[PDB]
Each structure stands twice: as structure tokens, then as C-alpha cells.
């Protein structure tokens, strides 16, 4: 084997600005090679070479430049990129936004060093995704519902439950079941939350008792906010090598990708990069690529990473740009409106631009019914009639609403009162709930129903 | 009938118009601070590396 | 040693720095100008000078300090005015004898010349003592008692422990050994504003900040080291909130810090504060100077010590937590702290982001504000205190769509909400309960039950009758009371009464200038109990409105008792008064 | 064979385009038609996913052969595509029963993928259509998100610090993108015999 080298250790920086940290006469660089950095105080911090131009080398330091001298600090050429050391025991543990255990137990032994940002999967290899997934939320699997490896998205603005959803979620997470070893383990990235809500969610997952199967990777919001962008690409590498290389299903969540997007602004602007719209780096497509483009189901092997991301519009609003990119590349929306929760609705998803792109494939034979397609639609489709028919009233009166648009608004009201909500703890299975969304969608007459066919729905029989 | 009449239109101002205008502003203000306004900037600050 | 190169306005690059560190503060030139270092290019330095750099000369001597923007912390530190950049305003003023600030003044932060009495703790001479421990207490004033905490990072066993008596803090009150190297410790301790205090375990708060506003204290509490926000622009509610934290909050100490705001507005607030004194429960009569810090940093000051302000107000009230006290800081103007950020992030062509504010705002902001919280003290003895930023915000024209105001809201737990519509309806209060939240009310509701298993219910009825009082108010709007029913209009008239007499408060009042919690509980109950006992007997609601007539005036009198007869002899009569409104309801049924 | 991705394919003479694009969707043929040899442009907004008219397109033309080359795309709709096409089937005025994967080929590189790769992509695609086309067929693409081709024009333009001219775009984002799309059109080969093939480029821009 070619033999060992120990890192050369220079003194050279020759300029400091901004959070990039200039050197000179480096011999050989190596472009984005970790280098730490080791201050005249003699603390050290991590940091990665961004430009690499003749023997110069514009390192960006991690946890900020301040206390940087330009005659007394070291730095350290590792001569490798950034790599993250995953290992099977790794489950059931907390890290921290670099990956510190902080769980006060004994790091990790790795069973092989892994890079992050791996290689995309040749799509030629690439699989389709081919079952449903029991979270234990009605309004979630009823409609739009999710595939065991497709990627989506909740779009939420702050101050909603979305983090008590996620909780839910992650504690109630199952298969169909219709295996504990290859059960869904959670893979939980946590980009800028709030200490409270760390200890919220560090609490509600040791409550549940599925420690055993989930990965907490934390990142506070005092963390550097470089930190935070290697969190998404350090929680992934690790889903990537539990499920594609171990087998087991992964539910991979990340809380606050907002966050993400403004961790991405902060570095840009940093640099002074090319900016898209609203300041945000040009290259953000790319980013929130790299970062959600990895579910999918690979041909060769039995595992499966399953997407759920979290996102939070900043002014409530869908047109800005992380949303937009996001719905741009997350194959879907699951949105929660605050219009709901103002009507004390706990879990407040609102179904009218909620839909799962990957729903076509999860509905099937093999599971759901046969009428799950056509009351999926009426119920989606019936709603913006409801709608139509609300503002008609508002803008004109209670007079206005015919025979017809009063039917109309009575399934608006009692789709929005029995249909959407849930108990906070409710495992509402699918067809009992199916049940009643057929009973929403005979509301309206049998024969008045234009996209559904009769026939759809009459081959299921109520009682 | 007139007070029919009147309060047709003046639901119509408040939820129509309105709402329709003001995010007719939102938009054109983001339109030219948004991006007309960091368009500059970024411009001049190219700028300035060249001259450096 | 070291020299200045070029001098375009506030920028300064000087020469012969190899050794200077990021973010260092210096002193510039012979007239002393303090500037932080921002970029070490070459072998040469880069420097952002506060005050006004006219006159510099090239060549002028440029003096290293070796440390970040910091501050002097222990003894005096209570009381004093300082300015942005930790400057002690009332001695500067007394030794220049002038009234202008001096460009380029050197007076040090606390006087190291005066004498405070010092008594060390029962430690023996040659024991071990780590960093946090509490090794002494000093008398800076009476019932202000101040520990003197060993610094940080320092640790060792005990060589010398000075006895007790007079000192100042220039004399070495002690010293000791980790290695065979020994230091001495002095009673000054310097820390830089940046990097927060450290902290043993971040604990999750569990005791209501009781403002003394029933308002505040029940319908919108707010828990001790939590974060608050005020839309605070006109009204003096803002002002009025400032001085009941001052006078009976828990806190056993306020830290205001002004930035960027008006000069006369903070001349007229820092002249109110010395007016301003509270009585002790023991009957003692005090100044709330004696536990009041104050940092006011007017438009006048330096854009840079503006936006240092708040970061020395967080360190000082971080430093006062770091003994176990319950402090509360106030940010006055977060809004001018962002402009000023602003104006900052211009001067260094930072790439703008969203109208205009740099991209790291909302980060800044969030570093902020993530400083408060209960947190378990550092080093023995064990103890444990709090800080809670009451920070307020200033939305342009009261559009919460600022993205100060945004991220503000999205840090900030408890959003208390002054309304100028009250304001110009008369609401002493001002407080909006249609905006208003407490976050924390889930975390608090141990507390709550603890006090009383029945408030909270009590609380959770009084919002849904806050609820139905809008919807009653577009009833009124559209048919008029006519259409309401026995059971509307009784719920009507409950959401009145709670409004005009135990939701407002009437401040100037002697009697309801402070609310204790016992008299905001009984109020609630004696409300809440008598709108169910009046609800279930749906009776004409015109013939319970005369038999209950003399009760609606008996309930404007139950919130006009004084808290001077006490809390059980207030409690007593508003309980006497329920119980006869709730005999009235059930035998007359 | 060989050529260069940037030089159009060699021709006679380009004429103009007379027989329209048989899509099998109501609204594409019948208000608004396209002919064979044309230029569309569909922008699908965020959330439409205008992939599925793509797909469609594909599936059900009338070209001889469609070589969907969506740059940018997510990889989920390149394995739809890659599972569906050879299952899913056509047939011929001859009456036998056949695949569309016999005559579909994917230039697609995905999202996650070198970003610089996406304009090698757009023009490998459209040389590749253009020599079926001098074959004498009635070829056809979609390029899915092309879009996606300009960050990666700005994330270059970026590094080079060239002068931004809208939105960080370069000066010669519209002259790049007519030097595509103007190499569609029905025309008669080079050489004996007369063949008369055309080329369609249904392209998709997603705005912000």
C-alpha cells in the first residue's frame, strides 16, 4: 500500500476577511480539503478551502474567523474532503451539527468512513416507489398520501404545530404491515431550532420508546451557521448507509429547511456570490437538490429512504423562493394552513393544494380500495367549489347560494368540521375514514358528481 | 333595494378590490426592490472587482 | 507600536499589526480612538474607527489592547449610567466637568479607586476552588448584596484568601495555584460581549415574570428567562411596562439598555428611572437605582457602540445571572439596533438581502435572544438563576412584515401586543387581547395548577369568552342586541364587565396600581364563576340584568379594593362579593 | 459517425412545416395545434408538474421518434420513464404489437448531478435529434426544465465574474437560446433519396 503522510502544518495566513481565511504559499493544495485550524489561543476549529488558485488557498473557517492572527495560527492540510464516520451502532444516538456525540457517551466506531455529498444514483438503477406508509395521520394518508420513497415536503408558516406534527409523526412511524429489523428507522436532522424545542424533541423521543431506531442530529441555533449546512449532508450520508447498505427503511425528517435556505443566504452573501431572487444564492436549485434528490428506492438493494422534509414561508407566502424551489423538486406538498388552526383545528392541513405527485403509484389493488382514486379527487376537487361558493355569499349574500351552491358549502362545512380533524393520537385507519369521506361526497346528490363515475363508488357498499 | 344594492357593492370594494390591489403593491414593490435594487448593487460591486 | 497607512473616513488601515487578532479592539492616534479590527491583510491591519476619525495623521501611533470588544464586570456595576461601549457617562461628565463627551476619553469603566467592603466565605486558605465558585459577597449598597463569583476558566487550590475588611478593587483580593504557577485575582473581570457566559445546564423555566398587571400576569403570562415582545411606538406603553418591571417584578435586578433612539426620550426616561422607587415587602422604602443598570446609547453615539449595546446589556445581565439573581433586560428599540446593523452592514458593502438588511439579521437576532433562560449557576455553591429579554420592536406603520418584526416574532415566545386603538380609547392596559400569546402557558400550567388546579380552566374560559366577544361584536354590528339571546347576551355582558374591570387596569391609581396575583386569581374566579351561574340558568335576559343590576356595579367595586388591607382582606371581600352573587343566581333561578 | 454538439447537422434546404403534431390531447389539437417541425414551450409553473403532458406527448405522437432529454429533472421521472415505456405499447398500420421504448432514448441528467453537464446535455440531445432527422424521420424532443439551463449558464457566469445582465444571467442567455431552438423545422435532407424529415423541440421553462 502507498505509504502514510502526516499533514503539513503551515503558518503562512496572510489574510483574514469575512469568514474566509486567506493562505499562502501552500504546497499542493486539494480543493475543499478540511483543513482545522488551530488558533494562538490553541483552540482548534474545522474549515473547509473554497477557492484553490495557484499556491494561494481561501479556507472558510467554521466557527468564525474572530481570534484569527496572521503570525501565530496554524493550519492543517488533511489532504481529504469532508467525511462522515457512519457506523450501524450509530443508532439511537445524538450528534451534534458536525456530528460531536453529545449523548455524553463514547464516540463512534466506524465501521467505514463515508463522504458526504455522495454520488447521485444512475438513474438507469433508479427504482419508482411501489407501497404506502403508515405515519398515523388520517388527513395524511387518506389524501396525498406518501410512498415508502418518495420525497415530501410540510409547508407551514411559524408559529404552527408543524414540530408537534413531525413529533407524532416520528413516534407513531410504521409500515403498512399488511420486519422489526428492517423496520423504519428515523433519521431526524434538526437545522436552527430553538433550545426549548431541543428539549422538546430530545424528551418526546426518548418518551415513546423508540430510541432504539432513531437518530437525533441536532443543531442548535447558537451553532456556527456554516455548521448547519453540513447537518442535511451528514443526517443523508448516514440514511444512505443504513438504508442502501444495512437495508432497513429510512424516514429521513429535517425541521426548518427555512433555516437551511437562510444558512445558504448567510454564506453566499458571505462570499458575495451571484445572487437569485430575494438575495438567495444562484445556485440554491442545485443545493436543495443535492439535499432532497437522494429518496428513492436503488433496483439491487431492499432499503428505501423516504423524504419528509419541514419547511416554514416566511411571510405565509407560497411565491417565495424556498418554497418554490422546493415544490419545484419535492414531487409534492403537504400544506397546513393557519386559516385552520385560527378554527382550533389540531392537526390543520389543508387539503386544497396538498397533493402527492407519487399518488398515482401508491393506490393501487394491493392496498387501499379500488374507489380511492375517484373520492380522493371528488374530495379534492369539491372543495374549491365550496370555496367558489363561500366567497359567492360573502360577496353577495346567503341569498345566493342556490340548490345547488348551499349543498356545495354544507360539504365545505362538514368536510372542514368531521373529515380533517383528528385526535391528537388517532390512528385512523383508512377505510373507516374512507367510509366517511364517501358520506362527504354523497352530501352531494349521486347524479350532480361529473368527474367520478357512479359505478366507482357503487362497487363499494356502504354499512 | 338601494340598501340591497349598496351593500352589494361595498362588499364587493372590500373583498375584491382590495385584495386585489394590495397584492397588485406586494408584488411590484418586491418587482423593483427585489430585484431592480440588488440587480444594482451587484452590478457596481463587480464592478469595483474589476477596478481591483 | 503601529502606525496608520491610510485613513478614508471610518476605515483605517494601519501598518506593523503581524501580530493583531479579528475583532480586536485597538486604540487609534494620539487622541485615543477606539476602533475594532475587521480585516488582516498582509502583514498589515484593517480597522473601523466608532468615533469621528477627522484630524487622524499618518503616522500616528496605533496602540494594541490584546482583547475583543469586552466589558469590566463586578463591584459598582449596579446604579451607574454607561454608555454603548461600557463607558460610565455620570464620572466622565463629573471629571471633564463639561457636558460634551471628550473624543477620546479614558475613563475606565468602574472606579477602581473607591472602597467596597469585602468578606471572603468560610473557605480555608489552602482548599481547592474551581471557576463559578462563590468565594465572597460584598456590600455594594444596602439590600443589594453582590457575590463575588471566581472567574471562568480559572481554577486551582486555594493559596490566599483575603480577610475581611475594606478594599478596593485595584488590591489582589486573591490568589492561587493550578500548576506551580499561582495568579491573583482581583475583583474586576473582564469578558468579551460576543461570546455568551458559561452556563452548566440550560433548565426549562417553571416561574411566571408577575409584571404586576393583571393583564400581563393572567390573561398573557410570561415566565421567568423567557423572551417577550412589545410593539412599543407611542402610547408610553412601553414606558409604562419598564416601570413595573423596575418596581415589582420578581426580578431581583433590570439591566434597560436604549440604543438608537431619540435623545430626548432617553434623557426623559433616564430621568424618570431615579424619580421612580419601590417599597420593600418588609415595609422598607428603597430607590430602584440601587438595583437598576442602565446602557443608553443615543442616534449621537457612535453607529458602531449602538449596535454593541444590546451585547453589553445580554453580558451584563448574563453576569448578574452567573450568582443566581433573577435579572430582566429591556431592550428599548430593537428596531434602531437593526438600523444601525444596517447602516453598519453599508459601510462594509455587504451583499443586501431582504429589504435591504444584511443576511445574517435574523441569525444575529436569534443569537440574541437565545442568551435568555433559567440555567443552573456555574461552580458551586448550587444555585440557580434566570434572564428574561423583554426586548420590544417598532414595525414600520404597525406592519408586522418587516423582517426585524418577522424574525422577532419567530424568536420571541411571548408577544404581549400594546394596541394604539386602546390607547385612544383610553386603556390604561393598552395590551390588545385579540393579538396577544403565551407560548410558555404550557410549560407554566405546573405552576398554575400548583397555585390553583381551577385557574387554569378559569383562564382557558376567559379566552373562549374573549372568543365569543368579537363574535358578539359582529352580532351587535349586523341585527344589533335585539337578535341576541338570554345566554348572548349574558355572555356579552360578562366580556364587558371583564374588559372595563379586570382586563384594563387603572395604573395611576393607588388601588390598582399593582395587582398582586392573589387579587388577579380571586377577580378571574369571581368573574367566571358568576358568568356560569348566570349562563346555566337559561331566564329573561332583561329580568336577570335588574335582579343582577347592583351586582354589576358591586363587581366594578371588587376591582376598585385596594391591596393595601392585603391580599386575604382583598380576597375575602371579592370572595363575599361572589358568594352573594352566587346566591343571588341560584335562589332567584 | 462523429460530430460536433455545437455545429448544427448540415442541410439542403429548410421549408416550411404543413402537417400538424397528432398529440392526442383535446386542448393541444384542437385550440391551440402545433405543426411537425415547430417550436412549443410550456412553462408548469411550481407545483403542475408539466412533466405528465411531456410524458403524454411522448407516448402518443405521431413523430417517429422522441429522445426526451429533460436537463434538471428529478430522477423519479426518468425511473417512471425507464419502468413504463417498454410495459406501455403502440401499434403500427402493419398490425403488430410493439414497445415505444424501441424508440426513445434519454440524454437526462438529474438534478443532483454536475451542474455544468446540463448544457452538454441540452446539445447532445438536440444534435442526436437532428441526425434522426437527416435520417428522413419525423423526430422529436422535449427538453424537460430547461430553465435548469440557465443557472447553469449564471452558476458558470458567476465564476468567471462576467458582467450580470438580468436577474445574474448573462448578455447571451436569449443568443444561446435562439441557437437552439432555431434548429427545429421540416427540411429536405442532404443527398438522394429526397428525404423530408423534421424536428420538434416542446421545451419547458420554469419560472420563479
Known amino acids: 500500500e502507498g505509504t502514510l503522510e502526516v499533514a503539513m502544518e503551515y503558518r503562512t495566513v496572510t489574510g483574514v476577511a469575512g469568514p474566509l481565511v486567506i493562505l499562502d504559499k501552500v504546497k499542493g493544495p486539494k480543493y475543499y480539503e478540511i483543513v482545522n485550524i488551530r488558533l494562538g489561543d490553541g483552540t482548534m476549529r474545522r474549515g473547509q478551502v473554497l477557492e484553490v488558485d495557484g499556491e494561494k488557498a481561501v479556507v472558510q473557517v467554521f466557527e468564525g474567523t474572530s481570534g484569527i492572527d496572521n503570525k501565530f495560527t496554524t493550519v492543517q492540510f488533511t489532504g481529504e474532503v469532508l467525511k462522515t464516520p457512519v457506523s450501524l451502532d450509530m443508532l439511537g444516538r445524538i450528534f451534534n451539527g458536525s456530528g460531536k456525540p453529545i449523548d455524553n457517551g463514547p464516540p463512534i466506531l466506524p465501521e467505514a468512513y463515508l463522504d458526504i455529498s455522495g454520488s447521485s444514483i444512475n438513474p438507469s438503477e433508479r427504482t419508482y416507489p411501489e407501497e404506502m406508509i403508515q405515519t398515523g395521520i388520517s388527513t395524511i394518508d387518506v389524501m396525498n398520501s406518501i410512498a415508502r420513497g418518495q420525497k415530501i415536503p410540510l409547508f407551514s408558516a411559524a408559529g404552527l404545530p408543524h414540530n408537534e406534527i413531525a413529533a407524532q409523526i416520528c413516534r407513531q412511524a410504521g409500515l403498512v404491515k399488511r420486519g422489526e429489523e428492517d423496520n423504519f428507522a428515523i433519521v431526524f436532522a434538526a437545522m436552527g431550532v430553538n433550545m426549548e424545542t431541543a428539549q422538546f424533541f430530545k424528551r418526546d423521543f426518548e418518551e415513546n420508546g423508540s430510541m432504539e431506531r432513531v437518530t437525533l442530529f441536532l443543531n442548535l441555533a447558537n451553532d456556527p451557521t456554516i455548521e448547519r449546512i453540513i447537518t442535511p449532508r451528514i443526517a443523508l450520508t448516514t440514511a444512505e448507509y443504513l438504508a442502501y447498505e444495512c437495508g432497513k427503511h429510512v424516514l429521513v425528517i429535517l425541521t426548518d429547511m427555512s433555516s437551511y435556505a437562510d444558512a445558504l443566504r448567510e454564506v453566499s452573501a458571505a462570499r458575495e456570490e451571484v445572487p437569485g431572487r430575494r438575495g438567495y444564492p444562484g445556485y440554491m436549485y442545485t443545493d436543495l437538490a443535492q439535499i432532497y434528490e437522494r429518496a428513492g428506492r436503488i433496483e439491487g438493494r431492499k432499503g428505501s429512504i423516504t423524504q419528509i422534509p419541514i419547511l416554514t414561508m416566511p411571510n405565509d407566502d407560497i411565491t417565495h423562493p424556498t418554497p418554490d424551489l422546493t415544490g419545484y423538486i419535492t414531487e409534492g406538498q403537504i400544506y397546513i394552513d393557519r386559516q385552520l388552526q385560527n378554527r382550533q383545528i389540531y392537526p390543520p392541513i389543508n387539503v386544497l393544494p396538498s397533493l402527492s405527485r407519487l399518488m398515482k403509484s401508491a393506490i393501487g389493488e394491493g392496498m387501499t380500495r379500488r374507489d380511492h382514486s375517484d373520492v380522493s379527487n371528488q374530495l379534492y376537487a369539491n372543495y374549491a367549489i365550496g370555496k367558489d361558493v363561500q366567497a359567492m355569499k360573502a360577496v353577495v349574500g346567503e341569498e345566493a347560494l342556490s340548490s345547488e351552491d348551499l349543498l356545495y358549502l354544507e360539504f365545505l362545512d362538514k368536510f372542514e368540521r368531521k373529515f380533517v380533524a383528528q385526535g391528537a393520537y388517532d390512528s385512523r385507519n383508512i377505510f373507516q375514514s374512507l367510509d366517511l369521506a364517501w358520506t362527504l361526497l354523497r352530501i352531494f346528490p349521486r347524479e350532480l358528481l361529473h368527474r367520478i363515475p357512479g359505478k366507482t363508488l357503487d362497487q363499494y357498499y356502504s354499512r | 333595494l338601494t340598501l340591497d344594492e349598496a351593500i352589494k357593492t361595498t362588499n364587493r370594494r372590500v373583498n375584491a378590490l382590495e385584495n386585489v390591489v394590495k397584492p397588485r403593491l406586494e408584488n411590484t414593490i418586491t418587482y423593483i426592490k427585489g430585484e431592480l435594487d440588488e440587480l444594482e448593487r451587484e452590478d457596481f460591486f463587480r464592478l469595483k472587482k474589476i477596478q481591483g | ?589
Not at chain 3, 119 to 125: R, S, T, V
Not at chain 3, 168 to 196: C, H, I, N, Y
Not at chain 3, 222 to 245: E, H, N, Y
Not at chain 3, 320 to 342: C, H, I, K, P, Q
Open chain 3, 1 to 589: 507600536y503601529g502606525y496608520v497607512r491610510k485613513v478614508s473616513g471610518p476605515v483605517v488601515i494601519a501598518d506593523g499589526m503581524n501580530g493583531a487578532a479579528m475583532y480586536e479592539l485597538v486604540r487609534v492616534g494620539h487622541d485615543n480612538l477606539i476602533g475594532e479590527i475587521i480585516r488582516l491583510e498582509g502583514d498589515s491591519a484593517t480597522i473601523q474607527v466608532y468615533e469621528e476619525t477627522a484630524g487622524l495623521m499618518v503616522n500616528d501611533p496605533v496602540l494594541r489592547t490584546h482583547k475583543p470588544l469586552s466589558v469590566e464586570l463586578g463591584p459598582g456595576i449596579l446604579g451607574n449610567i454607561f454608555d454603548g461601549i461600557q463607558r460610565p457617562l455620570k464620572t466622565i461628565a463629573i471629571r471633564s466637568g463639561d457636558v460634551y463627551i471628550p473624543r477620546g476619553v479614558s475613563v475606565p469603566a468602574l472606579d477602581k479607586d473607591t472602597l467596597w467592603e469585602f468578606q471572603p466565605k468560610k473557605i480555608g486558605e489552602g482548599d481547592l476552588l474551581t471557576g463559578g465558585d462563590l468565594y465572597a459577597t460584598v456590600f455594594e449598597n444596602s439590600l443589594m448584596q453582590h457575590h463575588v463569583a471566581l472567574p471562568p476558566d480559572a481554577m486551582g487550590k486555594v493559596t490566599y484568601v483575603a480577610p475581611a475588611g475594606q478594599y478596593s478593587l485595584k488590591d489582589t483580593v486573591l490568589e492561587l495555584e493550578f500548576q506551580g504557577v499561582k495568579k491573583s485575582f482581583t475583583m474586576l473581570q473582564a469578558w468579551p460581549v460576543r461570546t455568551p457566559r458559561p452556563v452548566s445546564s440550560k433548565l426549562a423555566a417553571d416561574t411566571p415574570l408577575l409584571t404586576g398587571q393583571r393583564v400581563l400576569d393572567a390573561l398573557f403570562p410570561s415566565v421567568l428567562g423567557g423572551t417577550c415582545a412589545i410593539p412599543g411606538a407611542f402610547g408610553c406603553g412601553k414606558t409604562v411596562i419598564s416601570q413595573a418591571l423596575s418596581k415589582y417584578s420578581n426580578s431581583d435586578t433590570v439591566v434597560y439598555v436604549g440604543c438608537g433612539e431619540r435623545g430626548n426620550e432617553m434623557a426623559e426616561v433616564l430621568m424618570d428611572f431615579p424619580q421612580l422607587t419601590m417599597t420593600l415587602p418588609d415595609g422598607r422604602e428603597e430607590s430602584v437605582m440601587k438595583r437598576t443598570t442602565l446602557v443608553a446609547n443615543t442616534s449621537n453615539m457612535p453607529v458602531a457602540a449602538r449596535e454593541a449595546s444590546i451585547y453589553t446589556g445580554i453580558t451584563i445581565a448574563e453576569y448578574f445571572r452567573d450568582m443566581g439573581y433573577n435579572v430582566s433586560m429591556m431592550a428599548d428599540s430593537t428596531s434602531r439596533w437593526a438600523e444601525a446593523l444596517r447602516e453598519i452592514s453599508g459601510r462594509l458593502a455587504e451583499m443586501p438581502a431582504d429589504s435591504g438588511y444584511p443576511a445574517y439579521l435574523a441569525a444575529r437576532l436569534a443569537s440574541f435572544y437565545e442568551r435568555a433562560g433559567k440555567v443552573k449557576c456555574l461552580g458551586g455553591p448550587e444555585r440557580t438563576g434566570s434572564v428574561t429579554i423583554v426586548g420590544a420592536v417598532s414595525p414600520p406603520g404597525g406592519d408586522f412584515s418587516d423582517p426585524v418584526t418577522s424574525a422577532t416574532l419567530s424568536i420571541v415566545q411571548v408577544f404581549w401586543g400594546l394596541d394604539k386603538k386602546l390607547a385612544q380609547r383610553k386603556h390604561f392596559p393598552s395590551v390588545n387581547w385579540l393579538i396577544s400569546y403565551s407560548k410558555y402557558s404550557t410549560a407554566l400550567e405546573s405552576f398554575y395548577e400548583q397555585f390553583d388546579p381551577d385557574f387554569i380552566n378559569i383562564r382557558t374560559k376567559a379566552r373562549e369568552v374573549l372568543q365569543r366577544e368579537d363574535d358578539l361584536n359582529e352580532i351587535v354590528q349586523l341585527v344589533g342586541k335585539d337578535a341576541l339571546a338570554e345566554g348572548d347576551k349574558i355572555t356579552l355582558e360578562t366580556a364587558k364587565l371583564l374588559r372595563e374591570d379586570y382586563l384594563a387596569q387603572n395604573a395611576f391609581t393607588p388601588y390598582d396600581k399593582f395587582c398582586p396575583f392573589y387579587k388577579s386569581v380571586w377577580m378571574m374566579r369571581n368573574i367566571i364563576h358568576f358568568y356560569n351561574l348566570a349562563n346555566q340558568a337559561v331566564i329573561t335576559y332583561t329580568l336577570i340584568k335588574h335582579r343582577l343590576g347592583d351586582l354589576f356595579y358591586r363587581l366594578v367595586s371588587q376591582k376598585f379594593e385596594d391591596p393595601a388591607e392585603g391580599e386575604p382582606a382583598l380576597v375575602a371581600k371579592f370572595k363575599k362579593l361572589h358568594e352573594d352573587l352566587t346566591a343571588g343566581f341560584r335562589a332567584l333561578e
